[PDB]
Amino acid sequence: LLRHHNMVYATTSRSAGLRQKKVTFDRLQVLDDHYRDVLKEMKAKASTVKAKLLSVEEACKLTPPHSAFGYGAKDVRNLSSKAVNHIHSVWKDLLEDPIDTTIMAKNEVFCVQPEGGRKPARLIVFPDLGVRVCEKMALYDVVSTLPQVVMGSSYGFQYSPGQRVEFLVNTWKSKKNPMGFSYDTRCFDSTVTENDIRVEESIYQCCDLAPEARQAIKSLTERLYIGGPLTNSKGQNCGYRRCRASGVLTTSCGNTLTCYLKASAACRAAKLQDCTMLVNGDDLVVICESAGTQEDAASLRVFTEAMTRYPPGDPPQPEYDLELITSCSSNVSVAHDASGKRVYYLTRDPTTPLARAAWETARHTPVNSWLGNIIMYAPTLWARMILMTHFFSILLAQEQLEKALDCQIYGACYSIEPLDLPQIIERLHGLSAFSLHSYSPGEINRVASCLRKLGVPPLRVWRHRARSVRARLLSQGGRAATCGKYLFNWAVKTKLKLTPIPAASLSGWFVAGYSGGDIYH
Ligand SMILES: CC(=O)c1cc(F)c(Cl)cc1NCC(=O)Nc1ccccc1C(=O)O
């Protein structure tokens, strides 16, 4: 796959200092009649939901076989009495009574910068297995049910990729005169103030809850969530945290539930019209009614002003074409199916997806980025022509087609069988996923260009490699041939007709976000 094996680098703890100074800064919020009004409507909805506690066992089953006092995930999962009793002893320590966490640096694989420069590692912050399991018993059923109730269609994790595109496209198509933009808040977790976290608590507490549930949430909120001590791998003090911890069950929830309240309110201060938000973590997209180009521009510096006092990285750009808006590193693009009929789909710059694919050939990994990406980007031309080709060839060589693999989707861990990709993709994207062609020159160029930049063979070659793989999958039959038939129809001159798959007939997959949670489904 990759030749320029030098621009591909992972982030280590050497660069922690860098990330600490990008992460350390004082916070100062102001509230408005807007802010508050959002809040009241929120709680109005929040107080609508009956939430229930998870038994120690249910919390145990939700722990990943390889997640991080004397026991491990395996022990937790088997319901080991050493494990279950130690957990009971934090749960009770929790109903009767600041908690410690671990601060670590993340090792993610990127590629050297545009125009040079290597991004500093991200800082992970998680209690230990025992705490984590208590987080689920108390909150899990809340971070799995609140956002959608409070934020309605605005909550992003409720969507599969195909559903996101649809919502984005129809939302855009419904404005008489649409204007939109993305807004990335600088180190959102670091901008989360203690007050936000309590407000959060408040909304959690708005829910029809279990007596101890509330007791446990409050404890967690004050003991674990508003902040606390920070310990490194060795065992020394690295400090204290007064904002959002990244590796706790509620982190995704809080950010989405928070970013929403700030933007939603800042959209009232900016006086921008029929504001529709798509929120997931700290990434926000807004599609509203244009008030005119210059009024829009002016109107957007006010949205910025208001976010700040409740900041951005790059200043937000007003946009009048949906494909031009970028969020989650993704942008909508269009192609045509087997009838020339236009199909919109989500795509992204393919550098990180390919870079981590390269890193995945060198060292087999804990989490298969390649598969996830195939699943989330099945309709894109780079994911079909390169990723599916490259990895099915590998699965063929090492004879691993049948081995299920651990895939992460929206921070949640899943067990997926490669041979199931056909059915899955039919579900998350529709049959068009297997007939898309006539991609945008722009899209084609970013891809064609990224291939040079990284030094991976050109598309024409992948097409041949695919004709070969396709052939070998067809020769083995069953699910594999179907993988050959459906996944590589794009690679042959005379296409075969792709009828809807029988076995294509995937809910838990897009309900909520669990980033930095410890979820296994
Ligand atoms: C919510 C979000 O970030 C997202 C939603 C989508 F609808 C699509 Cl298309 C892409 C997204 N993010 C960029 C990305 O690269 N995501 C992933 C890639 C592989 C496996 C999992 C994810 C993930 O976002 O969980």
From TrEMBL:
Cystine crosslinks: 267-275
Domain RdRp catalytic: 178-296
Superkingdom in the source lineage: Viruses
Subcellular location per the Swiss-Prot or TrEMBL entry: Host cell membrane; Host cytoplasm, Host perinuclear region; Host endoplasmic reticulum membrane; Host lipid droplet
Assembly and interaction partners: Homodimer. Interacts with host SPCS1; this interaction is essential for viral particle assembly. Interacts with envelope glycoprotein E1. Interacts with envelope glycoprotein E2. Interacts with viroporin p7. Interacts with serine protease/helicase NS3. Part of the replication complex composed of NS2, NS3, NS4A, NS4B, NS5A and the RNA-directed RNA polymerase embedded in an ER-derived membranous web. Part of the viral assembly initiation complex composed of NS2, E1, E2, NS3, NS4A, NS5A and the mature core protein.
Family assignment from sequence similarity: Belongs to the hepacivirus polyprotein family.
General function of this protein: Induces a specific membrane alteration that serves as a scaffold for the virus replication complex. This membrane alteration gives rise to the so-called ER-derived membranous web that contains the replication complex. NS4B self-interaction contributes to its function in membranous web formation. Promotes host TRIF protein degradation in a CASP8-dependent manner thereby inhibiting host TLR3-mediated interferon signaling. Disrupts the interaction between STING and TBK1 contributing to the inhibition of interferon signaling. Cysteine protease required for the proteolytic auto-cleavage between the non-structural proteins NS2 and NS3. The N-terminus of NS3 is required for the function of NS2 protease (active region NS2-3). Promotes the initiation of viral particle assembly by mediating the interaction between structural and non-structural proteins.
The protein's name: Genome polyprotein
Organism: Hepatitis C virus genotype 1b (HCV)
Residues of the full protein shown: 2449 to 2981 of 3010
